[PDB]
């Protein structure tokens, strides 16, 4: 559902940062904002 | 009166995180706004309700200087009528804003090898900020129906994230220092006057 995929996107944001992909992590952070702004 | 301490704001060693943005009240002083325009090669400089070149001529009751760091691509949200992760959840300007927004690239100061995690932003929030509201809370955001009880996990997310600025980042992801000048004219004496 919407809650599961949000968790997975959050999880991938954190993982990207932990593995040295901070710029990619910031782009996923942007996706989280847009996703939760949708109806 | 003395000179207005705009150097204390623009040339400060450390800037605030945007979600906990700093505000400095400027009053009872003379402001040479020329040292402002030549402080750095500004990547943003837009005034609202005032002419930028005529600031040394004007007088105001108070000047408020707000300052913080964001990503280059987010600088455009520091403007009236804007939406986005920063305008909604971190720093919000009113529609009737009277002042200037000034920004410059600070990659050489705020980036770090391995990542600068000192600068944070708010990713989660139930509603948008009001103009000039500041939310410094760190409550766990509840995305589901189950209350979180202060524990991070599924559907329960810590609301802040760090920028992690590194000098190798693209320019749109590099840190930018932002100063927002609010020019206030109340029914009261004007004690902040330009050098002219």
Numbering used by the authors:
A (entry chain A): 1 to 39
B (entry chain B): 333 to 528
Task: List sentences quoted exactly from the publication behind this structure.
The spike protein of the SARS-CoV-2 binds to human angiotensin-converting enzyme 2 (ACE2) through the receptor-binding domain (RBD) and changes the conformation to fuse the viral and cell membranes, mediating viral entry. Here, we used a structure-guided strategy to engineer an inhibitor peptide with mutation-tolerant and potent binding ability against all SARS-CoV-2 variants. We named the peptide CeSPIACE (COVID-19 eliminative Short-Peptide Inhibiting ACE2 binding).
We identified a 39-mer peptide region that was easily chemically synthesized and modified it to improve structural stability and mutation tolerance. The high-resolution structures identified the roles of the peptide residues and provided information on which residues to modify and how to modify them. To solve the conflict between specificity and universality in antiviral treatments, we engineered CeSPIACE to recognize the invariant architecture of the RBD critical for its function, thereby achieving mutation-tolerant affinity.
